[PDB]
Write an enzyme that holds these catalytic residues in place. Sequence first.
Site, PDB file in Angstrom:
ATOM      1  N   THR B   1       0.827  -1.199   0.000  1.00 33.69           N
ATOM      2  CA  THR B   1       0.000   0.000   0.000  1.00 33.69           C
ATOM      3  C   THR B   1       0.865   1.254   0.000  1.00 33.69           C
ATOM      4  O   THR B   1       1.393   1.654   1.038  1.00 33.69           O
ATOM      5  CB  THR B   1      -0.947   0.035   1.216  1.00 33.69           C
ATOM      6  OG1 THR B   1      -1.755  -1.147   1.229  1.00 33.69           O
ATOM      7  CG2 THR B   1      -1.849   1.259   1.153  1.00 33.69           C
ATOM      8  N   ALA B  49     -11.652   0.252   1.883  1.00 30.14           N
ATOM      9  CA  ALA B  49     -11.885   0.387   0.449  1.00 30.14           C
ATOM     10  C   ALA B  49     -13.308   0.849   0.163  1.00 30.14           C
ATOM     11  O   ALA B  49     -13.532   1.716  -0.689  1.00 30.14           O
ATOM     12  CB  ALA B  49     -11.594  -0.937  -0.257  1.00 30.14           C
TER      13      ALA B  49
END
Lengths: 228, 201, 239, 213, 220, 250, 232, 199, 204
Positions: B1, B49
């Site tokens: 990430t 998300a």
Amino acid sequence: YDRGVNTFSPEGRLFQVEYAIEAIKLGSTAIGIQTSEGVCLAVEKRITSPLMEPSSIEKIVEIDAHIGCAMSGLIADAKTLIDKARVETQNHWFTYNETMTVESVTQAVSNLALQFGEEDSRPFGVALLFGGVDEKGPQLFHMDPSGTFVQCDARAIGSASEGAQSSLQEVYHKSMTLKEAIKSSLIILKQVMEEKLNATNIELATVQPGQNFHMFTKEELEEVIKDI
Amino acid sequence: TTTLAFKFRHGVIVAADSRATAGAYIASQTVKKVIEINPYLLGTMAGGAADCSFWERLLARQCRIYELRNKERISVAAASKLLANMVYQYKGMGLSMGTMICGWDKRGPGLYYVDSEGNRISGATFSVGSGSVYAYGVMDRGYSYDLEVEQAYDLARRAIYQATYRDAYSGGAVNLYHVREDGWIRVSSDNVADLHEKYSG
Amino acid sequence: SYDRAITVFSPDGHLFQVEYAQEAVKKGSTAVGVRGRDIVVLGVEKKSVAKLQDERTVRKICALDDNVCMAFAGLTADARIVINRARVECQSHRLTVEDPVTVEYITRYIASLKQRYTQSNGRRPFGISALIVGFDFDGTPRLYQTDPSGTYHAWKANAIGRGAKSVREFLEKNYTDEAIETDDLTIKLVIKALLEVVQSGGKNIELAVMRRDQSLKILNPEEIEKYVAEIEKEKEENE
Amino acid sequence: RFSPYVFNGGTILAIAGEDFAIVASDTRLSEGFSIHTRDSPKCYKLTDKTVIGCSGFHGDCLTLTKIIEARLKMYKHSNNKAMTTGAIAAMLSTILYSRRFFPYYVYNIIGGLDEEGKGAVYSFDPVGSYQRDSFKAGGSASAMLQPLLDNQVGFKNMQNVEHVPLSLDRAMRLVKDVFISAAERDVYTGDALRICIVTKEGIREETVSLRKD
Amino acid sequence: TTIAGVVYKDGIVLGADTRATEGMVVADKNCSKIHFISPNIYCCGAGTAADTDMTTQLISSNLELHSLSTGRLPRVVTANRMLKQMLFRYQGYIGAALVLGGVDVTGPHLYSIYPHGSTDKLPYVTMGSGSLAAMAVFEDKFRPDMEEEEAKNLVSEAIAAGIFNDLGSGSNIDLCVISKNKLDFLRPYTVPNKKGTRLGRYRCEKGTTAVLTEKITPLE
Amino acid sequence: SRRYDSRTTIFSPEGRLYQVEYAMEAIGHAGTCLGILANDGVLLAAERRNIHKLLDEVFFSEKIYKLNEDMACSVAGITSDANVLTNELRLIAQRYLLQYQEPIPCEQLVTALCDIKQAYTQFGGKRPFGVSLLYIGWDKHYGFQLYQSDPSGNYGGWKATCIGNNSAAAVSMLKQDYKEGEMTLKSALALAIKVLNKTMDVSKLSAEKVEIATLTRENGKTVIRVLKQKEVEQLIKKHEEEEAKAEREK
Amino acid sequence: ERGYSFSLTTFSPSGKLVQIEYALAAVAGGAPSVGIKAANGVVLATEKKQKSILYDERSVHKVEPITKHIGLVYSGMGPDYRVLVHRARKLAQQYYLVYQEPIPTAQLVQRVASVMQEYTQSGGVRPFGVSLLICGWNEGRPYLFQSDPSGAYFAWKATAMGKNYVNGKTFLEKRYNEDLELEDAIHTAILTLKESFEGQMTEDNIEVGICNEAGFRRLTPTEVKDYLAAIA
Amino acid sequence: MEYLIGIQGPDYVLVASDRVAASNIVQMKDDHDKMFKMSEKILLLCVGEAGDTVQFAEYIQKNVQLYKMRNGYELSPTAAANFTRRNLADCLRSRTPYHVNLLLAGYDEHEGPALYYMDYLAALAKAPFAAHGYGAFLTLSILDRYYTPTISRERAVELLRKCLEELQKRFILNLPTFSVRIIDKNGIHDLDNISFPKQ
Amino acid sequence: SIMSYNGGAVMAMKGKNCVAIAADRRFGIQAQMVTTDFQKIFPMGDRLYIGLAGLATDVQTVAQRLKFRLNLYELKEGRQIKPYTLMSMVANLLYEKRFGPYYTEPVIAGLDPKTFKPFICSLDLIGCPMVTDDFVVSGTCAEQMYGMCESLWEPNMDPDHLFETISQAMLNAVDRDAVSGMGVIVHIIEKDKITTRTLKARMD
């Protein structure tokens, strides 16, 4: 005598609903036409005083990206339902990921057509003309405060709609293209109008799948003038 | 990430890794953390998300509805106000929103960084992620507001390459969009496998 | 037959208590106004003040912000609510959407609230109207109006009260680009169109000029006399 | 206290081809060594063009699927048309987000024919996040699937591995081969194996036996 | 903080200590923990002061509207029902240690109130921290049909014995005689325990301390 | 018969206020009050509706109500409907003093109750307030402020007031006696004695049937002076001395 | 007009208000109750006459004291009295235990009549035709007040309503002036109370309440007749 | 962690804000301005949780801007200090409590400038100076040693130079940029930015 | 704790014909000083004060809610408030919060509005009034608190002796602790005049 509004008549039938049809007469006259290539519509602004700004009050609004609209009768009640359905088309584009169809827009407003609640104390006499392009192509819908839904190839409202629908169905062309619909729109226009034609007197609305949106653009009204 | 965004001479460059995995187990390398809210705007995905997905879709709600009735220019102060206050209602309830508001202001380029805790500021460079600490070293040292768009393509992905080189959660395809006066412009989508030989000489 | 009007429409398709309410605006306090590419002006008068009473208590026209000002007519009872009701919304449009207040937003609020104000049996309708005076961002002019039915419309100039169409006929010559080229001739033209409205004695006359985005200031009986001198000199030299 | 979420077993592998789609899920429903029922197909077909699997907590699987079936007739009787593939994908993400406080515990993979008649795969999670992908592998046995799937299918972890589009019958033998290697380790994969193939002609199913322990 | 009560032939005698101790030191040296319910019914407060002080006034409020509207002497069974219903609704969230007693037309009645609202009918009840020695005096030395002066001695002895065996009990002993004809409340009665006197008296005078400033605000 | 129906919610029919015309009729019924301009102070007057001497007069200030230490009011109208407005503004002035720890400015104060009275004259078919009460006080900005409440919601606040309809004779007197900058609060007090002795129906200015309440600005006490009938009796002999002096001319 | 509708109260074209004005006409047709403020106490003499001899006054009580130091009597119609009784029984006892002390009766008349104001003034559907004579003892100086359905509280040394309201008020206006001797004020107050009263006067035909500075004491027909008629 | 100088002069109020919003190691935003302007007579200073400080910065701003044009004048510094306390008093007992640190600086026409005290516990105080953050012991060492209540605004910054030089002694922090303002009868006036050299 | 957070100690000792109440001027967070001018005892009506010790918010909030309901009653009837009325007003206001009660130490010291008779009382944070005739005791060290005040406080005290009595009482109890200090203010009121003095204490 002793009319009971939403409560029925001794004969009987609804009364104020018929008076809501009379509320369409006081509004501006809008004449819609649905064609294979697109949908063309025109309405007179009817400027009272030169202080009036031409784009201040318009009878054509955009419900959704692919959905046009033409209001009728009262304004504030229109823009109420207008901005309403604009939120309804926004929630339909979220859960279903697809833009709301012009079909379902009717029944969305038709459920709230006559509430007999706080709105719709007094009901709203605003008629609505639903244009746009759905998955079936260009479509033109007409509805009334009572909630009637009937698909019309060419529909007229307002003051002159009586005399407008007369010459309308006679010169209407279902199988032709927008090329004839251009000159076919100004025919009924110049008829009902008693004054000279300018960009500020009326307004044109033309929506097509390939050419859009459009809606309409500035200074295309005077082009149709000189094309006579 | 690894997510990074910076404003410069032309618009804002958005670059982020597409690797989304649980632990060291490879799961999905195609997850897109760069979301397009509007043709003229760009969103991002960080932390939850579905969180950043909802609110940006909820932000697009008010923005598109305000566009219909108006088509007037919307300031980012309108996006900062409504969004941060609605997210603050969920503060402490488990929602994590790390997205960075991107787009093009009529005046000039601008960048905004949003947090679920209520942290929102407008600054030149914002980079959030695991290997983002390695991004600040290579980027900010050679970072400049006058850098060309061609140099913005190389410098942004280089910080991604320095991150995604050896990292647990960093990898996948690099989503790179270039913002201009007409909105973002799609550049390229390049996997870390191609980043290996390209930036190493 | 005829039930007069409560809420539901009359058999003719129109209403009564609405049409009945607009006559209150005709008998209310008259007002005028003009706009220009930068500076704008307005006027009300119709104060009926004998100067033996407090002058600040009769003050009506106020401003939500320096950019957008409030100008109403009729009774100030319901208008004092329109002030406070718009002050909360303009402060919310201050608060939310931090940009300067847009005229489309604020007018729809008052309009959407003026529609439900006339709806329930329930909330009493408005018998008064108002006209928003101000300027768009970057110096562009803005002026609108209100209707007891909760609608808004924009004009090139403010003419209401007695002789709305008569002043509008004089506003046809106001459409020239010379007005307003200079703020000295515009104020002289305001006192011109206002001379045919009511008494126009100069005492109750109150005019506030807003230049560009700067907040307006009520003209004291000093510059008003100088602008009246050039208006009288232009009338004497016109022969 | 009472645990509202529990893992009931099962493994769902759905690989959607170019013009077709294949959804395979084991029918074994078991917790521990004991087997609740030997035949419990996890693949639920909403429409002819859509087949969704349901894994994890079984109470939420029946609830979520039957709600969609109730919401299938909603959009059906409204617009007189079937629901689009992107409609059910976002509707589930919105329902799961409104439930973000207390959600369902489910693992789903949607596959079938889209509006263009092609296959797609959406990886679902309890928070309602998804994307359009070619193939995905869920369930507790997916630990040995994706490394073995990307080997044969994705053609990774190898040198000079060309990418050949999988024929309808090629995806059948590959799913069976990765499941045999999965049943030898994970105890929740076994008994009868339900493989649902979505084609332009219709829905096709198959039953494959496996170990009973 | 110790309360006690007993039922003799001609009425009921209630009493409690005046010492309220917070921590290891006495907080309020002189306090009256007996509260007014009805003219014929008194209640002795204990446990949490403020919680019991507002509860005895609320039950007396429900009774003052009940009794004065009815116009006849109230009964203890009414105050008992309101106290057992209230505390049960709170499920012991309001700590209440009380002694409910009085002489009605039906005769004397005495109840032992607990913070949960459970009450029983007993001729002698003791509550508080010093209720251990106050109970032993009423257990062995009390029998029904007790004499007037024999009951008043039995109470003060139970309080004096309860104070000696309790760390928080002390200060003044109270005696409240409740009967049909005669109703008396005698406070203070006797102090069983005192605090040790100082070895000398110290006096502070001016010259060891100064003054900064001063302000004078005259009044009417 | 368009206006003969009981409505009280929606307006009348030519644009005039339906009930407000009738509300001012109740104000002119048995109302009494006056006001005048005074520097470094202010003065008000009251009239007792019952001249019967058997009354206890234990109400102390009755037609004059004190809503604040620095401010007071004079009720003219139905006393039953006004007592609801007394504690109303008193609590609104108290919740404002609670919030800012600063005395409520009478600008927004008066307009607060005027909008509260306006809500009862707007919707719900509620009965309008037929009581017009005055306002007096001092603020840090405009200093001495005078106001008069009206049912319609538009306050009759000015530097002078007319209560009731019978006071119209004193309005022509106040406009002719209008002055600026001279106080001497007693100059207007002696003028207010001429108001009661001439314009008012009751002559001789009966002390027990009237009341005079004055407010003198004092920092920071702001002492409100309830007289009440004490030296008003010598003001009677003072105004009669002026009448005895005026007859000496002719 | 009309024009005032209701909620809280009805309309009049000229003055006061119509509708409940008719209930005010019923107030004058109610039971007359005299009252006396004399020296350090307040005396209240009411009039109660049953329809037939089969009734015993020992059951129905027209004097229902709300507090030990505050009594009351009613001038007007029926149970709307008993309605505000239990009300004031709830109303006055709440304020009594708020500050735990009675506090002078002036504040009692403030609070207790405040809700009675709203209760009588606001729309009750049917109106309320019960007025009251308020009494009490405060700080050594008692008070005698008179309320009404319209909500106007008065102060009288000697007051009367119901019957004699025209005669007795003018009576006490002339014979009684300022404050006079305690028992001598009760004399002339009863003399005008027997003015329009029936020629037959018995212990059960009337009742006399008295508010002492030591607290209210409700008398009985026994001690009422044994005192004097003529009670003084 | 950080504190803005609370020097209170007779005719002026001296305040200096730190422009560093960065966290962890690297500096994300150098130019962040924590100073907000309510009106000309009253400033706005708050430190704490972002959403907390921002929401209180939006509330009190628009409420004072509302009351401004309402009656034609701004609330007094005493009334404005207790108005924020009403939002702070509700913050004490609430379902979602906030956290604030700094205080409010303002100016009055009649009473001159005044400096109040704000806290997350809603407690208020009146002091010419205060010390928040970790440098509390470092501020009172220099300030209590030499302080002039009547000192000029120019020399108050000169006395503030001793604070800026002593902001880093044993501390590993940086905070190079410090934005300073000044309050007078004319309202807020901008002052030069001070930068600390890293090496 | 919440009490020791802001600190402070209020002691109200009644004299013969007068009543005195005092509270320390120290206001700060824990062991750190802030300002010494923070007001604790606030005036209520005339010739009556009240002490407060605890969280400064609960000191200001209650004093604001108390003055709120006080002015409401004083505006209805212009007469002042009795100590028994204020004692029941504070006890009822503190009892309105059962599980949420504000943490403070209210001490009511003031003259009767009718006469010159002084009266003092103390109330718990939960609303429990604690009735004491004249003297109250507090401090830090135990031998000085209860040991000295017995021979210090007289049955009948003059303002001279009463001021010097609480002087050494606040010198020995407060200044003994390192963080306690920073001056103490004394309020001694009588029917003729209101006297306000401050105690000299070290600034350490």
